[PDB]
């Protein structure tokens, strides 16, 4: 009478219930997850595995809120109380009974990072995967070796693969990424929507919306007369030391930037969360504004006159605006010398100069116009390759597609 | 008080019974295994995860068959039928119900390699570990990376440490080794018995027993008029290609060795189980003798006039005989250039010459006595550092220790 | 070492879970129930094995609702949606996860009948048994033969003894009952609270509460000028015939009772659940009121000018009111001729006449004050033996015992 | 994965881990498939394994001669204390070997009930010889059974379960058949009226003077003396003091008959080792533990019994019987709790005092004429059926049965 798989689960759950394991919520879900639980107008959102309300899901959501308030919107979070969601969406805490109800019921899953393999994406449901940016470093399959603790390359890749096979829909911002995903994610071009990122929507539809460039600016208490510079270096293992209490000042040399640019500029510093609540910005008030904790990074872009980064997929997002970029790669030699661990030729076809010391960077920074002119060539070359595909309608395209998928399911 | 461990095993075992899983024998054992099971006069032996009747545990056991024949002797094998054990030992097949009774009951485990962590070594029993050679490559905790599929370096070292912590006694051949075990295996000097390897007993006790040497030689159908070169390279992953059906002839070049040394010598080829049954010694009959499957390596050392290896710990055992050794390291370049990946300075303090090419090896082999004087300096020095401790009396020291351990247990 | 009792339960539970047995809830309970589940201020109630909200456990629960609202009250039923409980108590259905949780946590059980042997009464827990009436017929240990199916006399006695051994306190109404309980129940005088029946409080406290008599009288649509007779015979197996679709009219002859008293009296029939829904009362309306399903038997006693019974322990409770009783023992012949199957001498020391034919009865029932005087002797003697204990503070004594018992534990 | 197999599976996990003794049984229950049956294996047991005796014996002895070729198995409580001739191997009850035997056999031969935890598959032919013509009513025909631990309905139920598995049931007479068809819930089609295999030697040997001689000197009996057998059934009433001499008055019998007779006492196993027979040496022989009872009847010139089914066996020899019913009042005054009319149609006199009994015993030949009538009426009602070829009939039937299975 009893099937073998149900049995294995039946025991697992007996063990979680009697030993008071916290995963009892999960095992129950495994036993009772039926293809019949799906409610065609329940859609579940989650971004970066629950840290945020943010990114492509946010916008795919905000659009679907203005055009179909009639559906049941659920968001998932690590700490639902510490997040704020506009509209009629209800929120669920990761790993609670509600969390699993939601994922079981939903006809659609919107997400921008991997969702856990312990969740059944039934053949009954559509998992739309937006991902979170054009790749610069190699990921998934294309990685060579991965000495990540607790997990080995083959196992890590087997698992990443089990997860992409669940992607009914994978978004792409460009053929560069489409070409890449196909190999890296074990995808079939059939399922890749080359429609651009919904989070990048507002880079197209608002680049000139002054009352809105002003909300952002006066939200951050930014000076009335000063142009904006964003700096966003990627995380580097290296630089962590001594409990993470007192850091050494940024290599970009802040005291310098204050001397050279303090009159004409202000610098939005966007660091990793560990450098940030370790950074003392005493006596840089109204010059360096810490911006690492700001929810929506696309808004930061809209108000920036240029973007200093190093090895980061954000250059591909900012490029939509065709503004100048500088690449402050002080540790470019420690990074393989001439590394092909990069899907692109970093040494040639990015839209700005590569600086290793931060002083000719600052000087150059004085006159943006000379840089915009000098590099207009490489900046447009960049815009056609990696940015020429966003409509401003990406949130629309996905949201509509959902809707469409859910009229059919309504027959 | 609810016993949360006992619960986890009753479930696991219910699972194995209902699903017809083969580990059902294992999970019963785990559920039911009490200290009260141990029979002070039961002793288990296993060598190389149950592949052989061989090595230290063989000798530790042969000694005991002769001086304490009244204890219950159980040997463990992957395939007991395909193994022949002298004396009174009963044999158990691994992962069979008897395998488990035998380890549950035994007051002493003897092994020369790792025994599985699913077996419970109660506070009640004594796990004596002999290991299987003086370390040259670095092992266990001393390793840097281990891209061994299925397991990550931390979780492999974790497990190893789990195993060594169960070693009540660990045998050692030399102060060199001891220093290393204490680190590589997480050992406390208290538990190390620097007494030499029981398997190396015959290398001392019988090295000049002519009649015994002759049983070994004629058991191997060797010429009478010819001296013996043994060749034992280690396993190389690199050299594997094409299903393991037709290897390329050994780098040592048999054809050349034949021309050069065919008149005075015969060469004993001791390879890995794979390079062996791919080899075609057609037309090297009575010169190249395949000897890969010969159960007792120590008997081979005894009849061997010199040894050729590369990076093997067998060089430390054969050193006991103060005979010549050549090191054909054809691929020394592809092993890190200058590799401290060894506990010793491989380029300097070993008992013979290092050859990267097999042709000047052959020549140098034509006159063993020159090599023996040329290197008597180094051969002796290598003996003082790695072989000085072997008594000949090592199966005795373990045999004794055990019996002495098991009178104590037959009183209070 | 190996905990064998636990092993036995783990196997049992594994068995129920895999086979989809309804008792899986029970066996989980047995495996996990532990002394530390007991919340000192949780108290379970149940009456007659979960049939009602009624009897002593009710009058205990209602008293603690007034003076000790702070505690957690749980009531147990077969069908909780079909029972109504005033106050703060939660209702658990029998044999359900919440029922077992309830008995696992409670510091005190209250019941008036036997509670199942599969519930563990930990040393931790105080089990109060109020029982449900002064014995007439002989019960438990004092029985001679019990040919009840599937179970032999020894095995029945063994299980009853198992139950009484967990009664931490047993209520008794009179020395006569104590004498008996002590033997029939294998009880220690020490554990017998001889305080009367809580369910019988109102017969002391409220006999004269003219406004309360009325709520009860108009609850039953009783005519105004008419006096009230209550007939309540015990169940007789012999009489059951024909699936229970049509009984031969009651031996008491309602047709006659109408002609004789249909002007002055109304008669309240309290019968067994099978005789009651087989009774045709066409044309006895406003004379014969079926009152079998009435929830509170004491309220009926209060408004009863006299009780007609036969071999029931109700004669004992109704005695507190010192009103007249008639014993219509039509079948006294069949019951042994001269049976000592009764703890008391039925033939001699009861508070009224033994009629074996219902015609003399009716006549006598015409003039009630003549009966009252004729027996005001036998009636007082009976009240001095069986009813002289109830101060109507019985519900209180128990509530305060519990409340005291659970102050001690809170330290 | 079946629900029945899962229940057994769990049971065995329990028995094995708790080292219960029924581990041997739960295993049997798990692995017992129809495929285990070996057509030429036959199991014998008599009285639940206390003996090598009775009908199963004679069926076995007969097949030991005409079919030495089959595998014969006998089941005992204490195999090391029983002597079995011929090829048969033996099994101890509730051992691995016992469940083997019973799973493997194509035929079970027994004379009393065999346990319900044993699986009688469609594959197997269970033959019940039972053990005697009923005088006390049994099984379904019982009124009340206050046997401790169990209830009348649950007892009749379990018995009905056992008889439902008797493929063949043996019967000594129409009178028994009548009673079996009702008392054991039996089909008349399944009853073989052939008489008792164990009575075979009462027909075939009664005049074998050399056999009679072995039996007689086996017991060290005197040569000039005739032989009386006394076989009073058991009475619960009479157990006391963890005894009092027999109500038959051995002293009197020794006085009145000691010079012509010798008296064989066949008692219940409990009165046997409470009896002191000092000073009756060579008059009263205790014969209560003698393995074979048909050999006793053979050498008995008469039988003194009371309420026992042995009168029906001994009848075959048309010899005088006596019925010392000293306590026939306690036994219900006039009880029809008997299938027959005791007070009438039995082959002998009902005595209630032992003294007129002793006198009548003096001259057997006069007893034998006085009663020739009633003795014949008795041989005709209850013993006419016995061929002396019963053992033969089963033996062959089994042989005849297992030539079929062999195709
Ligand atoms: O019978 C089990 O529940 C326990 N088993 C089986 C594995 N468990 C672990 C799990 O929860 O994933 C479950 C199982 O696979 O049935 C072994 C374990 O505890 O490590
Ligand atoms: O009843 C059974 O299913 C078997 N067990 C009981 C089954 N339970 C224990 C219990 O119900 O008493 C656990 C198990 O399935 O064995 C009794 C036996 O030995 O015949
Ligand atoms: Cl829906
Ligand atoms: Cl022992
Ligand atoms: Cl094998
Ligand atoms: Cl460990
Ligand atoms: Cl080797
Ligand atoms: Cl358990
Ligand atoms: Cl509490
Ligand atoms: Cl309900
Ligand atoms: Cl309610
Ligand atoms: Cl009562
Ligand atoms: Cl009526
Ligand atoms: Cl099934
Ligand atoms: Cl069983
Ligand atoms: Cl066969
Ligand atoms: Cl029987
Ligand atoms: Cl059966
Ligand atoms: Cl019988
Ligand atoms: Cl006597």
Swiss-Prot record, chain B:
It catalyses: 4-O-[(2R)-glycerylphospho]-N-acetyl-beta-D-mannosaminyl-(1->4)-N-acetyl-alpha-D-glucosaminyl di-trans,octa-cis-undecaprenyl diphosphate + n CDP-glycerol = 4-O-{[(2R)-1-glycerylphospho](n)-(2R)-1-glycerylphospho}-N-acetyl-beta-D-mannosaminyl-(1->4)-N-acetyl-alpha-D-glucosaminyl undecaprenyl diphosphate + n CMP + n H(+). The lineage of its organism: Bacteria, Bacillati, Bacillota, Bacilli, Bacillales. The chain holds residues 313 to 721 of 721 of the full protein. Responsible for the polymerization of the main chain of the major teichoic acid by sequential transfer of glycerol phosphate units from CDP-glycerol to the disaccharide linkage unit. Synthesizes polymers of approximately 35 glycerol phosphate units in length. The gene is tagF. Keywords: Cell membrane, Cell wall biogenesis/degradation, Membrane, Teichoic acid biosynthesis, Transferase. GO terms for molecular function: CDP-glycerol glycerophosphotransferase activity. The keyword Phosphoprotein does not apply. Its main location: membrane. This is Teichoic acid poly(glycerol phosphate) polymerase. One of its GO terms (cellular component) is plasma membrane. It is an enzyme of class 2 (transferase).
């Amino acid at each position: 009478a009893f099937k073998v798989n149900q049995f294995r689960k039946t025991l697992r759950h007996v063990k979680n219930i009697v030993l008071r394991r916290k995963n009892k919520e999960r095992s129950l879900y495994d036993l009772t997850d039926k293809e019949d639980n799906v409610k065609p107008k329940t859609i579940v959102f989650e971004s970066f595995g629950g840290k945020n309300y943010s990114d492509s899901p946010k916008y795919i959501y905000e659009y679907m809120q203005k055009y179909y308030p009639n559906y049941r919107y659920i968001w998932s979070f690590k700490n639902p109380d510490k997040n704020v969601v506009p509209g009629s969406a209800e929120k669920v805490k990761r790993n609670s009974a509600e969390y699993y109800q939601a994922y079981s019921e939903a006809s659609h899953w919107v997400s921008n990072a991997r969702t856990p393999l312990y969740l059944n994406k039934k053949e009954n449901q559509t998992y739309i995967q937006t991902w979170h940016g054009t790749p610069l470093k190699r990921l998934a399959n294309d990685m060579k070796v991965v000495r990540m603790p607790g997990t080995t390359t083959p196992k890590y890749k087997r698992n990443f693969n089990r997860e992409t096979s669940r992607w009914d829909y994978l978004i792409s911002p460009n053929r560069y990424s489409t070409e890449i995903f196909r190999s890296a994610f074990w995808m079939d071009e059939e399922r890749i929507l080359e429609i651009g990122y919904p989070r990048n929507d507002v880079l197209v539809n608002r680049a000139n919306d002054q009352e809105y460039l002003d909300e952002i600016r006066t939200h951050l208490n930014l000076p009335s007369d000063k142009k904006v510079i964003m700096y966003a270096p990627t995380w580097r293992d290296d630089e962590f030391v001594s409990k993470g209490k007192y850091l050494f000042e940024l290599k970009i040399d802040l005291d310098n930037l204050y001397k050279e640019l303090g009159d004409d500029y202000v610098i939005l510093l966007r660091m990793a969360y560990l450098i940030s609540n370790a950074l003392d910005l005493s006596g840089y008030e109204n010059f360096a504004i810490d911006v690492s904790n700001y929810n929506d990074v696309s808004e930061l872009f809209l108000i920036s006159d240029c973007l200093i980064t190093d090895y980061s997929s954000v250059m591909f997002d900012y490029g939509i605006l065709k503004r100048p970029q500088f690449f402050f790669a002080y540790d470019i030699d420690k990074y393989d010398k001439g590394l092909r661990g990069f899907y692109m030729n970093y040494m040639e076809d990015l839209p700005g100069p590569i600086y290793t010391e931060p002083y000719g960077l600052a000087k150059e920074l004085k006159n943006l116009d000379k840089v915009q002119q000098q590099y207009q060539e490489k900046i447009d070359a960049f815009y056609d390759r990696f940015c020429s595909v966003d409509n401003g309608k990406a949130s629309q395209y996905i949201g509509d597609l959902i809707h469409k998928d859910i009229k059919e399911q309504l027959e």
